[PDB]
Amino acid sequence: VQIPKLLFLHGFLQNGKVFSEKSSGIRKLLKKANVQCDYIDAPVLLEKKDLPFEMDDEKWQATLDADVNRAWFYHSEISHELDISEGLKSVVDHIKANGPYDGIVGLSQGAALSSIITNKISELVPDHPQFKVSVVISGYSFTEPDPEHPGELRITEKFRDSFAVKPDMKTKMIFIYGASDQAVPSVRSKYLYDIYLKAQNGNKEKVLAYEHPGGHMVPNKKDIIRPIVEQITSSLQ
Numbered sequence: 001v002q003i004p005k006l007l008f009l010h011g012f013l014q015n016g017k018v019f020s021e022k023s024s025g026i027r028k029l030l031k032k033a034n035v036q037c038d039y040i041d042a043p044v045l046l047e048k049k050d051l052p053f054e055m056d057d058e059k060w061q062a063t064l065d066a067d068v069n070r071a072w073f074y075h076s077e078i079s080h081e082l083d084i085s086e087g088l089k090s091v092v093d094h095i096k097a098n099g100p101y102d103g104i105v106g107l108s109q110g111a112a113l114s115s116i117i118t119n120k121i122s123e124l125v126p127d128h129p130q131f132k133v134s135v136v137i138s139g140y141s142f143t144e145p146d147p148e149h150p151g152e153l154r155i156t157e158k159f160r161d162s163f164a165v166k167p168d169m170k171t172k173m174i175f176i177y178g179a180s181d182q183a184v185p186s187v188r189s190k191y192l193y194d195i196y197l198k199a200q201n202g203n204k205e206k207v208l209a210y211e212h213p214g215g216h217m218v219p220n221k222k223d224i225i226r227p228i229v230e231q232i233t234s235s236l237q
């Protein structure tokens with residue numbers, strides 16, 4: 001005490017409260033291991049037209065009532081169109097005011113953003129050290145078709161620096177993805193995992209991957225979340 005602290009970044013169409021509810025199992029284990037888990041809300045307030053999937057008026061009202069019409073950034077299928085400035089500043093401001101944080105945990109948009117923040121934390125928040133641990137749940141990077149490599153993807157130029165990982169990072173990366181996930185197919189999370197693995201010269205003790213059988217969700221099954229939490233707590237020691 002003060003005990004280690006992790007910052008949790010939710011996914012598209014959630015908020016801090018809902019993410020806390022969805023991550024209750026992992027949070028229970030971390031709290032038992034004397035780790036503090038902080039949840040914050042994404043700043044981009046969505047209108048119905050900003051949804052990339054169908055939803056009726058009733059379900060949209062329900063979304064409004066729950067205060068979950070939120071994103072870290074507007075969705076686009078075209079990576080060069082993405083703008084993370086507001087969401088990034090929101091998290092950075094929070095860390096400035098409430099840090100330092102020993103680690104970070106992100107889901108889907110929150111995981112794309114948490115990965116970028118992991119890469120850049122010491123530049124974004126002067127005097128803040130590297131994270132000890134970064135947990136990337138159903139994450140992805142801002143890829144596009146590679147013109148000279150049909151069928152292959154590259155990171156869009158706007159975000160090349162953002163997803164660049166320096167060699168010899170102290171941070172332990174923990175990737176989590178669901179085998180059934182169709183919102184963010186695991187190929188995207190593995191693509192991002194590979195960037196870290198390469199930067200760490202193939203060291204699977206520093207860059208870890210856990211696949212669960214489920215879909216686009218924070219996993220809760222004992223046999224998956226226990227080893228994950230063990231890896232987090234061991235990095236914090």
Ligand SMILES: *P(=O)(O)OC[C@H](O)CC(=O)C(=O)CC
Pocket residue numbers: 010011012013052075107108109110183184
């Ligand atoms: P992530 O969940 O933040 O990004 C993936 C999609 O844009 C969001 C999504 O499929 C949903 O929010 C589904 C409910």
